[PDB]
Amino acid sequence: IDLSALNPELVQAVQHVVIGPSSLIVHFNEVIGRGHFGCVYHGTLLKIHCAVKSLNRITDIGEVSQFLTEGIIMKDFSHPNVLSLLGICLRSEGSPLVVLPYMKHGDLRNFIRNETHNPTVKDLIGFGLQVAKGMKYLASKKFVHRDLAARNCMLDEKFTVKVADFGLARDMYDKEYYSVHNKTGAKLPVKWMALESLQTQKFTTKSDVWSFGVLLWELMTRGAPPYPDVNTFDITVYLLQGRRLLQPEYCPDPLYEVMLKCWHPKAEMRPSFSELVSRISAIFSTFI
Numbered sequence: 001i002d003l004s005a006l007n008p009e010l011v012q013a014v015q016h017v018v019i020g021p022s023s024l025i026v027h028f029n030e031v032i033g034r035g036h037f038g039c040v041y042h043g044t045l046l047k048i049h050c051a052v053k054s055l056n057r058i059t060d061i062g063e064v065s066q067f068l069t070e071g072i073i074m075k076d077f078s079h080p081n082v083l084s085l086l087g088i089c090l091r092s093e094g095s096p097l098v099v100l101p102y103m104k105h106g107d108l109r110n111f112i113r114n115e116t117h118n119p120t121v122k123d124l125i126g127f128g129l130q131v132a133k134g135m136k137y138l139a140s141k142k143f144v145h146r147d148l149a150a151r152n153c154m155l156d157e158k159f160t161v162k163v164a165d166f167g168l169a170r171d172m173y174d175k176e177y178y179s180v181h182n183k184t185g186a187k188l189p190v191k192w193m194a195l196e197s198l199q200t201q202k203f204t205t206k207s208d209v210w211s212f213g214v215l216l217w218e219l220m221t222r223g224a225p226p227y228p229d230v231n232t233f234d235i236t237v238y239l240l241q242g243r244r245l246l247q248p249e250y251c252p253d254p255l256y257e258v259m260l261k262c263w264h265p266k267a268e269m270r271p272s273f274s275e276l277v278s279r280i281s282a283i284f285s286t287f288i
């Protein structure tokens, strides 16, 4: 790595992000995750159980100083509902490996769809509140997620929910839900996107608020696909007919009212993540 190529203020932070190969064993024999940009494997860090992501499906990782800079930013994030970066390990043959905490119970969507798990309505709302707290933190860091959805949050061994799939962990972990734009070629999660982002492909924290509303709907339907009878970019036409996802059977009325505020046609009128934490914690507190 070329320390000179970095912003001079960040050079000190590199030692805290870089993991020496001696400190990490990767078990390439068993894939635990699959993304478009690469596979994920069990690993042991010095005995800390971790998830090691390869980026080898990409032809190139871009500018190495930029990759490092991304890693440094990501490493300073610390919140119990945000997936942390443990570090990055430089291997001789191949791209760098990204080292994340192991998430025993996988992604939130699959967890709520799992027949062997039986969360209550209170539990599902609490999963939503935990996501809201993670997003309030990210928004306070002026970080825009761009791909918030239940598939992109994960659960650890204590069922703590963590906003995942950002920074160096960013990928498409379920290709079904990404559609190619015709003018730009970008693969977009159209069914989670705000109206304005469908039009401009610009994403903001207020478009993350829209996605969060969809995520709440996923939770209360225990992982149903949103808008099944709508096809890809016909979602814009569908929404502009004056439509929204219907209230799920076991979704409390005030929680559906929160969903509708998250889908406000004017981005600036949608609630902040701080407001969502406040409103959801109240609704959650009414359940036993």
Ligand SMILES: Cc1cc(-c2cc(F)c3nnc([C@@H](C)n4ccc5ncccc5c4=O)n3c2)on1
Pocket: 032, 033, 034, 040, 051, 053, 083, 100, 101, 102, 103, 104, 106, 107, 110, 151, 152, 153, 154, 163, 164, 165, 166, 169, 173, 174
């Ligand atoms: C479906 C699905 C979703 C994911 C997923 C979603 C994320 F938001 C996400 N963020 N980071 C990851 C990768 C790096 N990851 C992280 C931890 C982990 N722990 C246990 C098993 C697999 C993983 C994993 O794939 N993710 C995988 O993997 N399969």
